[PDB]
Amino acid sequence: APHLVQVDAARALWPLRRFWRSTGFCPPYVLSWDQQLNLAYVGAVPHRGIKQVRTHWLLELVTTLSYNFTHLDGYLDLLRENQLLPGFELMGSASGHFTDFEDKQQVFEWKDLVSSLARRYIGRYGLAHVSKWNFETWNEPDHHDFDNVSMTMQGFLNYYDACSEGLRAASPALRLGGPGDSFHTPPRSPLSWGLLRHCHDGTNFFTGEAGVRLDYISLHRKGARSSISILEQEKVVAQQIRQLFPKFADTPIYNDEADPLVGWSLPQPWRADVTYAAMVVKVIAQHQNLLLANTTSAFPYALLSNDNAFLSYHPHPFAQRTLTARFQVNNTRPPHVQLLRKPVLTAMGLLALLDEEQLWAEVSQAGTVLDSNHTVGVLASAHRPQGPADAWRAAVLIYASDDTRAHPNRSVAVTLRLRGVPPGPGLVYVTRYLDNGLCSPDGEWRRLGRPVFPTAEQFRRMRAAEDPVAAAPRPLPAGGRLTLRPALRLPSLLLVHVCARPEKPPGQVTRLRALPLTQGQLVLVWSDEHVGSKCLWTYEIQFSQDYTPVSRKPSTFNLFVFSPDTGAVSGSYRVRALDYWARPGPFSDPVPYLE
Ligand SMILES: *[C@@H]1O[C@H](CO)[C@@H](O[C@@H]2O[C@H](CO)[C@@H](O[C@@H]3O[C@H](CO[C@H]4O[C@H](CO)[C@@H](O)[C@H](O)[C@@H]4O)[C@@H](O)[C@H](O[C@H]4O[C@H](CO)[C@@H](O)[C@H](O)[C@@H]4O)[C@@H]3O)[C@H](O)[C@H]2NC(C)=O)[C@H](O)[C@H]1NC(C)=O
Ligand SMILES: *[C@@H]1O[C@H](CO)[C@@H](O[C@@H]2O[C@H](CO)[C@@H](O)[C@H](O)[C@H]2NC(C)=O)[C@H](O)[C@H]1NC(C)=O
Numbered sequence: 403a404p405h406l407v408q409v410d411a412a413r414a415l416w417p418l419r420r421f422w423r424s425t426g427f428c429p430p431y432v433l434s435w436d437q438q439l440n441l442a443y444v445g446a447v448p449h450r451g452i453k454q455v456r457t458h459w460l461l462e463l464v465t466t467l468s469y470n471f472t473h474l475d476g477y478l479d480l481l482r483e484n485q486l487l488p489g490f491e492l493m494g495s496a497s498g499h500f501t502d503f504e505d506k507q508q509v510f511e512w513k514d515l516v517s518s519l520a521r522r523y524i525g526r527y528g529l530a531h532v533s534k535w536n537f538e539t540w541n542e543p544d545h546h547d548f549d550n551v552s553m554t555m556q557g558f559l560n561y562y563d564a565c566s567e568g569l570r571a572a573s574p575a576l577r578l579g580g581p582g583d584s585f586h587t588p589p590r591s592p593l594s595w596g597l598l599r600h601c602h603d604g605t606n607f608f609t610g611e612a613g614v615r616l617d618y619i620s621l622h623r624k625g626a627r628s629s630i631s632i633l634e635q636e637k638v639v640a641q642q643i644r645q646l647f648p649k650f651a652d653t654p655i656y657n658d659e660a661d662p663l664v665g666w667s668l669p670q671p672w673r674a675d676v677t678y679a680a681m682v683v684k685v686i687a688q689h690q691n692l693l694l695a696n697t698t699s700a701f702p703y704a705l706l707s708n709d710n711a712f713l714s715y716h717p718h719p720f721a722q723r724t725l726t727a728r729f730q731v732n733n734t735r736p737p738h739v740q741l742l743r744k745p746v747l748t749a750m751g752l753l754a755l756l757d758e759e760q761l762w763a764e765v766s767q768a769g770t771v772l773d774s775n776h777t778v779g780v781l782a783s784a785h786r787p788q789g790p791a792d793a794w795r796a797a798v799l800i801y802a803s804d805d806t807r808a809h810p811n812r813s814v815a816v817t818l819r820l821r822g823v824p825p826g827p828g829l830v831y832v833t834r835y836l837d838n839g840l841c842s843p844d845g846e847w848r849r850l851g852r853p854v855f856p857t858a859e860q861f862r863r864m865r866a867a868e869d870p871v872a873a874a875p876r877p878l879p880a881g882g883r884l885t886l887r888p889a890l891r892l893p894s895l896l897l898v899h900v901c902a903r904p905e906k907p908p909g910q911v912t913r914l915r916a917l918p919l920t921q922g923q924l925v926l927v928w929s930d931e932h933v934g935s936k937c938l939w940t941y942e943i944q945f946s947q948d949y950t951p952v953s954r955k956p957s958t959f960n961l962f963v964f965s966p967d968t969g970a971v972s973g974s975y976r977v978r979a980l981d982y983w984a985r986p987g988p989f990s991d992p993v994p995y996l997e
């Protein structure tokens with residue numbers, strides 16, 4: 403008996419916040435060409451779909467009394483050019499200088515270092531920007547990854563106070579949290595629990611005052627292959643913190659490593675296709691619906707990060723916990739690198755289409771109501787029109803997911819019933835669908851017989867499977883209603899997008915870049931901040947050799963790989979946005995390219 407999904411577009415309930423716009427990784431590199439492509443792909447997720455890159459060992463990018471910030475500057479500018487912000491973990495030894503945090507003299511040094519950089523990057527990027535940064539403590543303090551740096555319980559507190567006072571020295575507007583650990587039951591997690599006690603009741607190493615600033619409490623809780631397990635563990639900790647530390651009852655909680663399974667480098671077949679992609683969405687849906695949608699004890703949950711910014715190494719291009727699939731093509735002159743947009747990343751773009759208000763939804767099956775703690779669930783959103791550039795929007799994202807388990811055999815009958823669409827000009831809807839049959843680059847790689855050094859055409863055919871199967875913008879049935887009966891696969895994601903026609907056309911594409919891949923092959927990447935609407939069909943790309951359309955299948959991802967059969971790539975490019983009503987926006991300023 404089918405699953406019934408009901409959406410009431412009239413019933414805009416609470417606000418909906420895009421709390422999942424973060425990724426992260428650990429270096430083993432950060433300035434190499436591999437990473438520059440990687441972060442271009444990450445920053446290319448439409449509508450600021452990913453915003454933060456939580457980066458380990460950032461203070462190893464600083465050398466040594468004075469400091470050389472050259473390497474750190476490089477990475478931060480790379481983040482900056484890709485419209486990203488660091489998850490600035492204050493983690494490193496400044497090239498082996500810092501060794502002991504019970505060393506009174508080193509505690510003062512650290513304070514001065516943190517102040518140094520914060521001010522530097524305030525100078526570099528503007529306090530407005532740097533205040534948005536989540537400055538954080540050393541990653542997982544209770545997991546002992548300090549290298550030669552000695553960090554005792556007391557040491558960790560001096561460390562923190564210096565982090566906090568140092569940041570304040572730069573500006574009071576700067577945000578710092580921690581510890582970024584798991585928070586197991588005591589006697590376990592001594593430093594995580596010790597930190598809170600210290601902030602709640604301790605004395606500031608520098609000022610001697612009681613209580614120390616803590617703008618957020620960050621934890622890591624992973625699923626062990628179960629999606630609800632993440633939400634369940636978080637509840638336990640968040641409640642323990644409310645009751646043990648009453649001052650922190652309103653302190654925002656981040657889970658900045660909220661992954662299905664610990665061990666990114668561990669190959670897993672589900673980490674390759676839409677199994678991972680649908681599950682990531684399921685985790686988020688569960689968090690929205692069963693934690694943040696006005697329950698009874700609504701814990702302050704502000705951030706969920708999928709720690710999947712890693713680069714995959716051979717012989718596991720798709721199977722590892724990464725947003726992109728890396729190919730080190732070692733047999734061309736010279737050896738070059740290529741990246742493939744995995745389903746999980748494409749899925750981040752579908753989440754990105756959700757807007758600031760959550761609509762009322764209900765998933766039932768032949769009578770019985772089902773919370774997102776089941777294989778099929780939904781997130782639905784509505785948008786209040788801002789300027790003349792946008793109109794009313796509805797984003798309905800349905801997922802089908804058995805977590806870490808795929809079932810190609812099975813088929814999931816679903817009947818969506820949308821009601822109560824506010825009346826307005828030119829109401830059309832668009833469907834976007836992802837599954838393992840139609841939308842898996844790993845799948846197509848495997849049909850091609852797993853080429854270890856793929857050719858041009860092999861890459862073209864693998865990229866064919868990146869974007870979700872889209873349907874032409876059909877007009878919405880009379881009386882603000884719509885009924886669909888899709889057959890969903892397991893796993894699968896489906897996003898029905900209902901938009902009304904705004905007054906003005908879309909805005910101008912900006913910040914266009916050409917990034918070389920190999921002979922006769924490049925990446926075109928851009929930015930949508932000024933586009934000013936989410937109702938887009940595709941980006942028209944035009945090429946000149948002293949302008950004609952580059953013919954490609956529809957895609958609203960802010961990255962395109964140009965691999966023409968002629969090999970002719972040298973010239974000039976420009977890009978513009980094309981909405982659901984065939985309306986062209988202004989072209990981006992032309993970008994030149996010489997090979
Ligand atoms: C094209 O050319 C590139 C180089 O230009 C080659 O890329 C190298 O690929 C190999 C694997 O194919 C990489 O080596 C592997 O690194 C993994 C992670 O490395 C880091 O992490 C570990 C653990 O945290 C550290 O110990 C280590 O020092 C690194 O910091 C390891 O997990 C791998 O080891 C595992 O497999 C081997 C068997 O191969 C076992 O012996 C081990 O026990 C372990 O299980 C492995 O060492 C390497 O990093 C890549 N180099 C670069 C510079 O990118 C490609 O190989 C080549 N392509 C082809 C098809 O040949
Ligand atoms: C999500 O659903 C599962 C059931 O599928 C719940 O797990 C059950 O929890 C109860 C406690 O109320 C136990 O008695 C059962 O043994 C569990 N059943 C199974 C099949 O594991 C789980 O608690 C639900 N969690 C949330 C947060 O809704």
Ligand SMILES: *[C@@H]1O[C@H](CO)[C@@H](O)[C@H](O)[C@H]1NC(C)=O
Pocket residue numbers: 470471472473
């Ligand atoms: C910092 O280091 C880089 C190389 O890593 C070097 O080229 C540069 O001269 C150094 N800068 C200063 C100011 O010493």
Ligand SMILES: O=C(O)[C@]1(F)O[C@@H](F)[C@H](O)[C@@H](O)[C@@H]1O
Pocket residue numbers: 427428541542659661663664665666667709
């Ligand atoms: O799951 C992991 O591989 C991981 F090692 O877990 C944690 F130990 C780390 O802090 C993360 O960098 C990383 O996601």
